[PDB]
Amino acid sequence: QNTLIYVVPNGSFVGSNIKLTYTTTDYAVLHYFYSTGQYKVFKTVSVPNVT
Amino acid sequence: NVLPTLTELAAGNGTFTGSLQFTIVPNNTVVQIPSSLTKTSFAVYTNGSLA
């Protein structure tokens, strides 16, 4: 119900990442914060460069 | 502002990317190599100027 799964081939494993973009489910929030740039929020999860 | 504005690659990341080009514009600076050590004098205009 709450799980997201990203699968990449062998060649795309290095730095395989997911970017989450959350948008308001509201018209007023889209309208009133278009200028400030805080009506949609994005973040990323990536495979760490590990030793 | 002729300098490009470094745009962040991600929200709250700390990495800002732009563009920086370089070239060499020759200038004048006389360097004298005496003939007492080479039998032929050398008047050398140096590298130039980094731009």
Q: Which of A18, A39, A44 to mutate to test the interface with B (most CBs of B within 10 A)?
A: A44
Closest-CA residue of chain A to B12: A43
- Residue B38: what residue type? T
Closest-CA residue of chain A to B13: A43
Give the SS3 label for residue A2.
coil
Q: How many helices (H) and strands (E) does chain B have?
A: 1, 6
First to last CA, chain B: 17
Is residue B30 within 8 Å of B44, Cβ to Cβ? yes
Round the CA-based radius of gyration of chain B to a whole number and report it. Answer: 22
Cβ-defined contact of B10 to A44 (cutoff 8 Å)? yes
Q: Are strands B7-8 and B16-17 parallel, antiparallel or unpaired?
A: antiparallel
CA distance B1 to chain A (A): 22
Q: Which tokens go with A5?
A: 């799964």
Is residue A36 within 8 Å of A15, Cβ to Cβ? no
